Amino acid sequence: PILFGAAYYDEYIPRDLDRIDTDMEMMTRAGINVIRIGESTWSTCEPQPGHFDWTHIDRALDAATNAGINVIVGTPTYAVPTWLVAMYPDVLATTPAGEPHYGARQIMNIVNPAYRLYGERVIRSLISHVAQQPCVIGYQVDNETKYYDSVSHDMQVMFIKQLRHEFKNDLEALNEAYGLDYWSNRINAWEDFPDLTGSINESLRARFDRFRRDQVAEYLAWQASIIREYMRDDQFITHNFDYEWRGHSYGLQPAVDHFRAARALDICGVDIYHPSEDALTGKEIAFGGDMARSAGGGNYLVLETQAQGQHGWLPYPGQLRLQAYSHLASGADGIMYWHWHSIHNSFETYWRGLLSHDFESNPTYEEAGRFGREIGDPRIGDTLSHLSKRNAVAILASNESLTALSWFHIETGFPMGGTLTYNDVLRSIYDALFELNVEVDFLPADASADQLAGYSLVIAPALYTTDQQTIDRLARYVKNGGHLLATMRSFVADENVKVWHDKAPHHLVDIFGMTYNQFTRPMGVSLKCPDTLADLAGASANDFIEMLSPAPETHVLAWYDHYAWDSYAAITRHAFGSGDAQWVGTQLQADAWRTVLAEALSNAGVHTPGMELAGTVCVRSGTNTAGDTVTYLLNYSGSPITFRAPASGTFLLGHPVTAETPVTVGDAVTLPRWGVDIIVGRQPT
Amino acid sequence: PILFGAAYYDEYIPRDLDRIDTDMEMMTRAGINVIRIGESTWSTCEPQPGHFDWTHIDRALDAATNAGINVIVGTPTYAVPTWLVAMYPDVLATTPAGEPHYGARQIMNIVNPAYRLYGERVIRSLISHVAQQPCVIGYQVDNETKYYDSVSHDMQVMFIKQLRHEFKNDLEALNEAYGLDYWSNRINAWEDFPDLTGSINESLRARFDRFRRDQVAEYLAWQASIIREYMRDDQFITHNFDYEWRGHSYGLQPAVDHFRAARALDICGVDIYHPSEDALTGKEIAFGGDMARSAGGGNYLVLETQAQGQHGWLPYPGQLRLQAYSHLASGADGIMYWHWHSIHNSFETYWRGLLSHDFESNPTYEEAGRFGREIGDPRIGDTLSHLSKRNAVAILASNESLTALSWFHIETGFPMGGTLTYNDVLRSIYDALFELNVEVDFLPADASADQLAGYSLVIAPALYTTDQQTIDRLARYVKNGGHLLATMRSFVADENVKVWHDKAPHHLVDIFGMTYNQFTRPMGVSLKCPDTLADLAGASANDFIEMLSPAPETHVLAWYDHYAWDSYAAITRHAFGSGDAQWVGTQLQADAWRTVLAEALSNAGVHTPGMELAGTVCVRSGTNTAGDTVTYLLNYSGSPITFRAPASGTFLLGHPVTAETPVTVGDAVTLPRWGVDIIVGR
């Protein structure tokens, strides 16, 4: 059935209480069938070196067993004990800010041998101890693992050795690849290799970031490999990925390549956090879910999301339920809250769980339990689980480009100034599509020809650095009938972040039917659109403009409206083989992005039910394991709304209209504020 | 008489001058009867280790003696000589910023042995040298002393031993009290105890902060105890406390507990600086005076305030006078300027004294002298000194709550984000009261049953962390007839900053007649006020809202006006015993605070004639030593004002009306811009 649950910290509950069995009863009452334990408390289970105390782990396993609740056990390696650092200070990484100081979780040097050695021992002892317990259904490897800005000596030497291997000891080739002549930065003998911390060369720095991302992935695989020596055949290994953090889950994760790192896992997990209250839009849940579903090639677990949340996140009545159904609408096969309660000391005292600091019932917990009892009814649960999505549009995601542009800021070309980031461009586009009710998959930028070929529209947002093979695949995708749309600052540099030295866009001048070699930060530049984009006439060009020189054969969709720049296009499209290729040479406002992308989808022949409801209600859909269509209707607003049904079949939930009421496409539908219902393409049962 | 003076630095005066007797004469001309010397110049009086040179100290004592001026001697320990750090670099504290570098004052590790050894030596030599000089009337111990964010090894080890003592060596108890299971932070053996610098556990950090605050209090008591070995029976020990600095004196001092630290002294002293010119309000003078008066249980000395001041403080004509009288209206028994002149080199070149860089007369000095000759006339001096204030309202101050919310920000729960601080809440209440012409005392949060009992209204501004005993006193205070008003984020946590785990407000749900367990940052939330607070109707709820669930018998003064939260109250008041208890579950704008407080005060039976003049003129009063009522009328505006006299008696000063003109409550009164007079009820 659908996983529904919460992280539980027996280790944190005040010791003067004895309420574990009460907590378990509150959970089963709320339709909770799974808890997560163990990951944050190494110092409780191994209180002195070599001395293991499973009191708290056993208590949770026993209490869950007695309640009929399942358990996912997390390895406790993301936060280290006082006794470990006392013996080995280097467990804590040196960063660019200098020497570390004990306290915070996730400031360790993940390649430190004391960290790996003791880590391996607690992993072995914990997983050995719990693996045969029937309530344990799976494992979380570590927790939201990154490399934590480590520039420790060892990590650097290891990087130098990998550079030797990559370049077959040839420093002429390395210095040329990275342009290291500049500012007298050549490395002409391996023993002269400087400390990377002060490097001003982004070719080198990027490669080091990539190396360290790869170490994250290897560390996860290594942990998974250890759990594989103990686990039962009916258990799974997962991990809780997280996203760029801007007060909440925002964009592609800078420190980890989720596509690559997910290969060690049986199923992808993810943590998603987002604005609520008047600011609930659904966008972060959908973005988060689409990236997890894409990284894992199918259904994923939401291992953490918000209950009462941080200050400001407390959900209006109805919002918790609407947030939950949203996850299922992106294809989640589980939802778990972080966490069951609210902790009474220390950093996350006010990142609040289902229960408040009094451990009483409250309206948020009660709303959760109404949700849990809904999906725990098989009539609802069997209908919503394992949802399959077949999307026609893909967005290309690139950790290498995020890294590159974090240094060469789009607007300035330097690691200072500007406000537009890679994830801003990505989200500007993702969010426009969301506003139009068009659903997307994410693809890594090095996706195969077969993968690309599945999609009718492929979008490349500020896809700044790629290899030559990637360019060639995309040309071929277009030739064979695809539609490629790229934005400014794409295909600028090779995989070593060296800007190509032929005509831009590199090896795509004939595909896009244009070239450029000039750009600026626009002052009072707007757009003239003669035809297909007539609705865009007048829109502003923002942040950065590329002076696109269209070929004589190319269709210009927009020109700069400015006396210095009006010889140049802002937006072009050009046929090539059976497909076409569009470039957007500027950043657009949200309304302009919706205009451009709605036209592009129309050009590409992409239609989905709910497109007509854009701006009225959120519609997201899929096919269930009976092969029926499932259409969610999600009202992300504080007013009731009326609209016409986008599909025919039966209302699965009912809404303030009863469950199993039939509906026909076109029928009037009303949802209350923060309301939801779901049409399933079958008759009532 | 009233002390009136300035700090004087003969050590800093250009050496080509010989003007000390001219300075002294300009001082006596201006009614100045005391100077403060010695505290900033260790390297001048001990130029090489063990070699003392009292030339400058002697010059000042001889010149003062010759002019009939009294002297307060400061110990010079808050800035250290180059020769001391050259031997002992650990004199300078390690901070979370890392290694220190010599130059600034007040970057020492106040528990360092070299610092305390050489410090005891200079103290003993200086005090011994001056103690029997008739002009010396007292002593300042160090100067605005704090712990300077020291995380030096010794201070940490000392703290660990203090923890062993407090938990009786029981690390199981310590880990539970502080919740150190979280993020694998348990300390399971004493030898594993980590550096505190990078701790993310605010129960532990807050306790370290409290320890270091107590080390400041001890340091002050240690110096006072040395000084007591030499001083005459006719002399006093004091200290210049200071406030949270936000460009000027703003709020409760974060690094020192003035109520505790003040115990070692004969009389409290204070340094107060504030906006002037168009932004002169008198709020900071009154806040700082109320605090200092409260900390020491009576009259206090303003050991420093602004003369010409920093750039932007230069007072408009009339304002220096108005500022001065403002201090005496709060209960000051002395006013000293920092400082006499304007220094020609170095960091405070432009923190300017009475005289400018040219040492000439100027209008600010001349205004100060007109004021000093005023109070120097016993008709006025005698009437105004040792003022005694009996207030009906108390505000509870808590360093522990300041500390806790410096990390757990009201709005965010984290040490980043938000704008609303503990002191902002305290000042929001204080300022509304001042604007209502209501005078207050401060009490420490742990104030005794007897101290609480003396007040008709007690206000708990964001009293985030307390012990259980404080909560039980307060409940008894209400049961017995008191009126308690608490704001949001009060009584949340125990004295270890561990949030209580029963219903909130902890052991007070019966008293306030309400519980809450939900809160948020409000978006477009207003208040609905059905009766008693009808004037507040439509006011904004700001910064944070607690979802109060009132008992059936509780009076709901304000509900949330918002479709998500309108089941919940924002402001509640509940009868308990013969008193009552009111909770304001959000932050209010300034005008909303006046509306709320004016109603609470009326509920509590507090009314005076000055409250009728709120918004028009500042009225502050007390009783002088002949038993007469002294009523200040202070105009903190750039225009003239007209109003009805709030008391009968005689005008003391005269104003643009002669000195000693009679007046009767209700008589029309006019004051010029920045004006002042005083009605004395005889």
In 10 A of CB B356, how many CB atoms? 15
The phi and psi torsions of A279 (rounded to 5 degrees) equal -100, 10
d(CA A283, CA A430) in angstroms, rounded, equals 9
Q: Which residues of B touch A313 (CB under 8 A)?
A: 520
Q: Which residues of A touch B563 (CB under 8 A)?
A: 316, 638, 673
d(CA A520, CA A570) in angstroms, rounded, equals 12
Tally the residues of chain B.
682
The phi and psi torsions of A244 (rounded to 5 degrees) equal -50, 135
Contact A327, A271 (CB under 8 A): no
Domain residue limits, chain A? 1-387, 388-613, 614-685
Closest CA to B573 of B654, B451, B484, B636: B484
Type of residue found at B123: I
Q: CA-nearest residue of chain B to A104? A: B200
Using a CB cutoff of 8 Å and minimum separation of 24, what contacts does A410-413 make? A410/A462, A410/A488, A410/A489, A410/A543, A410/A544, A411/A521, A411/A543, A411/A544
User: The tokens of A561 are what?
Assistant: 């409206």
d(CA A144, CA A146) in angstroms, rounded, equals 7
Are A14 and B176 inside 8 Å of each other by CB?
Answer: yes
3-state secondary structure B425-468: HHHHHHHHHHHCCCCEEEEECCCCHHHHHCCCEEEECCCCECCH
Q: Is B194 left (phi over 0), alpha (psi -120 to 50) or beta?
A: beta
CA torsion through residues A361, A363, A369, A373, sign: positive
> Which of A311, A319, A350, A356 would best serve as a mutation to test chain B binding (most B beta carbons within 10 A)?
A311
Q: CA-nearest residue of chain B to A78? A: B183
Angle at A376 between CA A370 and CA A379, to 5 degrees: 110
d(CA A418, CA A481) in angstroms, rounded, equals 37
3-state secondary structure at position A418:
coil
CA distances from A543 to A498, A586, A588 (A): 23, 7, 9
Contact B132, B231 (CB under 8 A): no
d(CA B598, CA B570) in angstroms, rounded, equals 17
CA torsion through residues A496, A497, A501, A506, sign: positive
> Which of A346, A359, A366 would best serve as a mutation to test chain B binding (most B beta carbons within 10 A)?
A346
d(CA A465, CA A496) in angstroms, rounded, equals 8
Q: Which residues of A touch B521 (CB under 8 A)?
A: 311-312
Distance from CA of B462 to the nearest CA of A (A): 16
Q: Which residues of A touch B414 (CB under 8 A)?
A: 347, 350
Distance from CA of B194 to the nearest CA of A (A): 6
d(CA A542, CA A573) in angstroms, rounded, equals 20
Are B179 and A81 inside 8 Å of each other by CB?
Answer: no
Question: Strands B668-671 and B641-644, how do they pair?
Answer: antiparallel
d(CA A432, CA B474) in angstroms, rounded, equals 56
Closest CA to B623 of B330, B388, B379: B388
Type of residue found at A668: A
3-state secondary structure at position A302:
strand
Contact B354, B7 (CB under 8 A): no
Q: Give the residue ranges of DSSP H helices in A480-589.
A: 509-512
Q: Give the residue ranges of DSSP H helices in B308-362.
A: 319-329
Residue A685 DSSP code: -
Q: Which residues of A touch B408 (CB under 8 A)?
A: 349-350
- What percentage of chain A's residues is helix, strand, coil (to nearest 5)? 35, 20, 45
User: The tokens of A523 are what?
Assistant: 């002052």
Distance from CA of B186 to the nearest CA of A (A): 6
Nearest to B517 among A86, A357, A673 (CB): A357
Are B182 and A673 inside 8 Å of each other by CB?
Answer: no
Contact B573, B554 (CB under 8 A): yes
User: The tokens of B255 are what?
Assistant: 């690094």
Roughly what angle, to the nearest 10 degrees, separates helices A399-407 and A202-228? Answer: 140
Are A343 and B185 inside 8 Å of each other by CB?
Answer: no
Q: Which residues of B touch A342 (CB under 8 A)?
A: 499
Structure-token match 């592609």, residue found: A252
Q: CA-nearest residue of chain B to A349? A: B413
3-state secondary structure at position A71:
strand
How many Cα atoms occupy the beta-carbon half-sphere of B245 within 13 Å?
9
Residue A218 CB partners (closer than 8 Å, separation 6+) = none
Distance from first CA to last CA of chain A, Å, rounded?
A: 20
Containing H/E element for A269? strand A269-272
Distance from CA of B32 to the nearest CA of A (A): 53
Are B185 and A308 inside 8 Å of each other by CB?
Answer: no
Residue A200 DSSP code: -
Structure resolution, Å: 2.0
Q: Which residues of B touch A350 (CB under 8 A)?
A: 408, 412-414
Cα B194 vs. chain centroid, distance in angstroms?
A: 34
Question: What technique determined this structure?
Answer: X-ray
Contact A206, A163 (CB under 8 A): no
Are B188 and A82 inside 8 Å of each other by CB?
Answer: yes
Are A47 and B193 inside 8 Å of each other by CB?
Answer: no
> Which of B151, B178, B184 would best serve as a mutation to test chain A binding (most A beta carbons within 10 A)?
B184
Q: CA-nearest residue of chain A to B505? A: A358
3-state secondary structure at position A443:
strand
Are A345 and B501 inside 8 Å of each other by CB?
Answer: no
Are A76 and B184 inside 8 Å of each other by CB?
Answer: yes
d(CA B315, CA B317) in angstroms, rounded, equals 6
Are A346 and B203 inside 8 Å of each other by CB?
Answer: yes
CA distances from A676 to A31, A308, A323, A654 (A): 20, 20, 10, 8
Number of CB pairs, chain A paired with chain B, less than 8 A apart: 163
Are B182 and A40 inside 8 Å of each other by CB?
Answer: yes
d(CA A45, CA B493) in angstroms, rounded, equals 27
Closest CA to A330 of A369, A274, A370, A263: A274
Are B180 and A346 inside 8 Å of each other by CB?
Answer: yes
CA distances from A272 to A36, A398, A558, B495 (A): 16, 20, 38, 35
3-state secondary structure at position A245:
strand
Distance from CA of A306 to the nearest CA of B (A): 14
In DSSP notation, B457-498 reads EEEESS--B--HHHHHHHHHHHHTT-EEEEESS-S-B-TTSP
Nearest to A358 among B191, B501, B544 (CB): B501
Angle at A352 between CA A348 and CA A356, to 5 degrees: 125
Are A47 and B195 inside 8 Å of each other by CB?
Answer: no
Residue A54 CB partners (closer than 8 Å, separation 6+) = A45, A129
- What percentage of chain B's residues is helix, strand, coil (to nearest 5)? 35, 20, 45
